Design a binder for this molecule. Sequence first.
Ligand code: MG
Ligand code: ZN
Ligand code: ZN
Ligand code: ZN
Lengths: 166, 97, 267, 171, 10, 87, 107, 543, 112
Amino acid sequence: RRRLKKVEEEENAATLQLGQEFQLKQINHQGEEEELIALNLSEARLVIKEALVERRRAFKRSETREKELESIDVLLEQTTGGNNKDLKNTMQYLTNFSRFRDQETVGAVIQLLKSTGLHPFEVAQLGSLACDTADEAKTLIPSLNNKISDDELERILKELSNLETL
Amino acid sequence: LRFGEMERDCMIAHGAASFLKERLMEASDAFRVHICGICGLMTVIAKLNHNQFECKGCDNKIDIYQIHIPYAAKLLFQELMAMNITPRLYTDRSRDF
Amino acid sequence: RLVKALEDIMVHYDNTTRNSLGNVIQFIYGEDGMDAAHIEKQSLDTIGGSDAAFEKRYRVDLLNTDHTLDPSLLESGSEILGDLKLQVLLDEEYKQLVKDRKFLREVFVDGEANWPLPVNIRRIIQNAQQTFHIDHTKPSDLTIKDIVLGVKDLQENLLVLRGKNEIIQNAQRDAVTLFCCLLRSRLATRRVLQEYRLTKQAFDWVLSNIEAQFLRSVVHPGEMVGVLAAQSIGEPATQMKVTSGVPRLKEILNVAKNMKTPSLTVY
Amino acid sequence: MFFIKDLSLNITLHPSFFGPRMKQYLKTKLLEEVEGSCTGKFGYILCVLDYDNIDIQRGRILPTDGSAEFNVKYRAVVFKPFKGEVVDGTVVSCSQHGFEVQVGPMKVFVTKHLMPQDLTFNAGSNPPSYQSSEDVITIKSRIRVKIEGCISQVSSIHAIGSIKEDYLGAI
Amino acid sequence: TXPGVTXPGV
Amino acid sequence: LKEKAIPKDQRATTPYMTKYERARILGTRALQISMNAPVFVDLEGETDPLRIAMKELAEKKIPLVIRRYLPDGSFEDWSVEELIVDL
Amino acid sequence: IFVYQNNITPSAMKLVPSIPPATIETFNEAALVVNITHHELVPKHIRLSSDEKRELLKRYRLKESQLPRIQRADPVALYLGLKRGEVVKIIRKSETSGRYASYRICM
Amino acid sequence: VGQQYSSAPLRTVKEVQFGLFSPEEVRAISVAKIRFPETMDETQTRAKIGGLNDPRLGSIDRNLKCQTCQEGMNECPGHFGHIDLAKPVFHVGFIAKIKKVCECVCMHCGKLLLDEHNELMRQALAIKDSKKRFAAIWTLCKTKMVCETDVPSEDDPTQLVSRGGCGNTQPTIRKDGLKLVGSWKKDPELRVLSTEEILNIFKHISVKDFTSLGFNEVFSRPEWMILTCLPVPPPPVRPSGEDDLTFKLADILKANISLETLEHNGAPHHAIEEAESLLQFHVATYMDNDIAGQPQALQKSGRPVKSIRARLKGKEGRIRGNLMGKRVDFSARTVISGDPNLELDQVGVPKSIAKTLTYPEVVTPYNIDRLTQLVRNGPNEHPGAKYVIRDSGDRIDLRYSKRAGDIQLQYGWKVERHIMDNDPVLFNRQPSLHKMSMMAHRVKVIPYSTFRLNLSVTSPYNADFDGDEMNLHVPQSEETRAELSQLCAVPLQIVSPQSNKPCMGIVQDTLCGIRKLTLRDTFIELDQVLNMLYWVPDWDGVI
Amino acid sequence: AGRAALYKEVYNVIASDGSYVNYRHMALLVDVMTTQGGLTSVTRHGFNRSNTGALMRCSFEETVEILFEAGASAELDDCRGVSENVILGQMAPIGTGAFDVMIDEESLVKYM
DNA sequence: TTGTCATTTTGCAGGTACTCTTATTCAATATG
RNA sequence: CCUAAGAGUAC
DNA sequence: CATATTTTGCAAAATGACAA
Ligand SMILES: [Mg+2]
Ligand SMILES: [Zn+2]
Ligand SMILES: [Zn+2]
Ligand SMILES: [Zn+2]
């Protein structure tokens, strides 16, 4: 309720104190509740590209890193206008640190991490970070301690590293 | 001229709500005052030219609203505050009808 | 004081009368849902008169001669006699009229016939008679089944509450029962065919206007009936053995344990 | 990290703007106002999803004013930095107090206090960089950094990061 | 009474 | 708000426009016309915004809806087009 | 129902509430000489069942407190043995319409 | 020019949540600590820093901006200060409530006396509304005068269950003026309950205990009924010849300083108690000067001081005198006269009144020409315009602007022009006991100094022409104009809902004439028949 | 029966001098006076002692005491009454204000 | 182990608008 | 300018 | 010589016993 000025804890991924508006369940615009899904770098980049191409098509009706950057710049200029410096920086950051290429690989990754039955924040971090070993991932992400077996995390990171291309 | 209580009652009986609001606000005294969503008090420092709104105590700067109330209403609320009463004004419902 | 007490009473879109807290004061405004400005004093014909006068006014028999109808009144006056279904219709209509007579005599113990009701049927009948030039000599084009079914459909069409459940339907019937009694009292088969001598188009026009005027007389949601009632009581007070007038009004509003003239009536 | 969230914005339209292209005006005015914006409640707001049919609803006329208040609901992609989160980035500048790393749309300033003692600033090289015993961190160099604090700023945000933990630095 | 002319009582 | 909105197929309010509804529609439309809102009807030379709104209402060319609020907070949406102006 | 002549000792009034669901109602014979329900001022009272009360609250979108109240000491409520929360339908011969139905919740 | 643009979102107040200031909230919202009773410094030309008119609370001079918000007196709401009281004092409006609360709570351990173990406490606590709960709890716990550290078991009155009681004996508390005196049962010992100890015992009441007493955990805790920090209202509340509130606040500061010095330098308990009583009296009379029994705090001129409660209550108080009803602009009042030649819904308006009262018409392509013509005519002749409101908020007075030349109107601007014929205007006669005594008429501008109205409309107004005055209000927007013409118009009021019959009729000369005209003896020759037929405006033209 | 007797008393008062008032006004008055289960008087100790909102209740009588009790009890006023909106200077939910006027984009496009 | 009955104190507010005129703002003793 | 008082107009 | 301070309408709530 109002609660006047209520105190709150400081956010920390170690404790997973993301926030009152970053809870696991969020009420969607349709009125029902959906799990808080988080996008990894490649998945977020694909989502951005899909949104931009859809916007470009709606306006119209009404791979290598260099060519990808040229295409995204041209499409950004054609679709939207100005004041997109933050968007341009995010887009180039995503293209530079692009862990995956197309829909098939990101879909396989997301379904694999869904099969892990783990927290969306943790699986998104695992998909984004390109870790190598298991203890390295555990020390990088404190939230993964005492949640999954060491061998299972190691092997799933092995498949993720195998799926890495370019 | 005095638009007394029972003139307001006659206008209510006529059902003309907007005319009553215009009589009580635009014709007499309309005051724009700023409040915050944390505490309903009017203790919001609003530097309009610099575009800076800040309620000290609540320590918020991004949760400010402006409302149009009669200056007599603002004076009544400030007098209640001076008399150790908090007439907190909120812009959303916390309870269902 | 009266205005402040009733200032927040309003008619809502479900026809209930509620205050600012949503408490139900009346489940329908004025117990009939009608705007006060659309109410006129009219006479209920069934409640008064004698039993013989009531039969002569309303009873119609197609198989006897004591209460038969003149065949010249309507076009098919020589074919209706000897019918069975039409006699059943007249039987149920007269039974309903008798039930209405008993009901009205129950409601008004003094037998007062003139009461304020929404739609003025008499003016509608006069307007139809003057508009369609009723010659009062030509046999009527109407059929009895037409009259009965038209009255029934008109009763079905007088809607005050638009809900679609048993509670709301019962409330609607309770709301329109008295006006339906008046309507059956006026648009009876004998009275239509003999006293007024409607035609088919004139009867349809009368039904349409009754329905339109009844729908137009329903109170509008959002009406501030509380302030209206407070003013309608207070203003006549300014024009003003047992205490009366302003002192009695003050004793009533200020509910006082001890009053000047406590009197009791024994029958 | 990047998320997608359900957001709502109130837009007031003048009476003069209720032509047949009102939907177009509302869609355009939602953009240029929230696209690429920044706030402390949701971090950065980068783009809007499902632009084909954004929920505009009906729109309420303000009494005595005539303007209409639409509560447009939409899906927005956001980037909210969080405490104790490891993220990749690129160094863009270095200074005496520390160095700035480009993470998405934000610049995280890692101070010289949050690095191992082997790494030291060096202004001799052009451009000045950070050089250690085993590796050197220069401009346009990939580096992984763990964010442990965030500072809300005007139309921007300057978080606090570190590389002191194991397996933090250039890849 | 009233007041005027509390209650009674109070 | 989805729970509040009574579905159109089972609205139980009067299909006739109330006097207050008509007054507010005429006032709102006149105020909008006074502020150069587009006109959806042809003008026969009339210049008063109120009578322009009256002409718009006469032939149901007002693109507004009434959100009738029930005492419990639920509401029904009635387009001006489908409301019957009998008064 | 206990029907007494003059009065009940208050030492017995305190033990009137027995173990539920058994309820004890006390009436004075002087108060029961004339049946109040036959008075023309007293309209018809019908107790509602739980399903009927639920339907009444559902159809009118009402809460418990928004209904008109009837005290749990009213002579008609004592006559019918109303318990708190139970709703009586009141049938009345109105003069604007023939029949009017009200509802009162016991408090 | 009004108020300039603000980027903050515009909403309407949906809920008003009441409560009490916590002292820490007062200290947080206050912008200055008031310490010096003086309002102006020794130079007598500027506001003293730290005085009662601190510039941080708002500017007392139109020439200077507020030191806090850097806004003029038009915009600045005024920002509160705070006075840190030397010792806690009772709030004069809560003393009775404080007595009830301390009579419901143990005066030593600070726990509610009758817990749920008592039979009647389940009934008391089951009550929903806070006020009824508190009434029941008080009327059952006022008679208990022992903390009852051990109580009979709820299951059976055989074994004893120990609760968190201390076993002390609660005193009987009365009020003697502005203080509470407690008499403990003699093992009576009478002593004045210090406000400090009552505050301490209030701060020890558990959350569950005082939430059953009606108090709120977030908005009103019982210990907040004791004043430790006084919120000082800004100068807008007490504009200057200082206001009564300023003098009372100066007295409060003087008493506070006296008590603080006495405590700091050491003094006999009698002097300390006297200073404390003086401070309590000053605070109480500042908030309420109409305390029964206690003498009124007189002003320097020997009259009672107008306290805040005096400002709020009464017919002329804030609520009834400035909020429920208030003086309004765009209103006229003058003597009324009858006119048989006016229509039922018409009202005759003197030309001077029509030249004074104005309506703002938005400049539109449909009315650019006539509005421009009215602007050209100016305010000195009727019809004409008095002001031109620009889209930027700047206002052009038609007087003194004829030198600048002709003004080019632009769409969206407003022309504030004289009310013309057929303008809907609300028309009233007071007291105005019913809605028909306040109706919408159409203006007809006439060349004499009285309002003119039809004879048939005098009955709903209860108006004669023996000196009656009537009031005229002009709507200032299209919405108000339209709803006034479509809801309050005179023809729509002919049939009153008061008695479902017409409220206007034929009266006075017309009634006598209509009786004399319709007699069987009355015959009219051709010439008079033609004149009478022509006098009927809608006569079809056939004899 | 008390409500019926109250209506009869008020009707007798009104019609003692021959004046006539429609039934529904007196019916509304006597229903308000008896809606709480007892005879609620039109006085400070009657209708003004409900939970109908502090701002509404203070506008009649005992203003400052009502405000003090509201502050101590932390009453929440939902501003559903006329007096609350009159004090706050906003359109009351009465008459023309008993509903919200909104814009249909689809109908507006459908016109042209 | 429970009713009884019989004196002494408990709070107050008065309709709606509107016009005009008149007086008065602590006096005086006391210290800087 | 405020306050108080008095006289008065229409109810 | 000038500013500062000394007519009206009651039902209860509360009280003092109390009685075995
Ligand atoms: Mg007169
Ligand atoms: Zn705040
Ligand atoms: Zn300021
Ligand atoms: Zn204790």
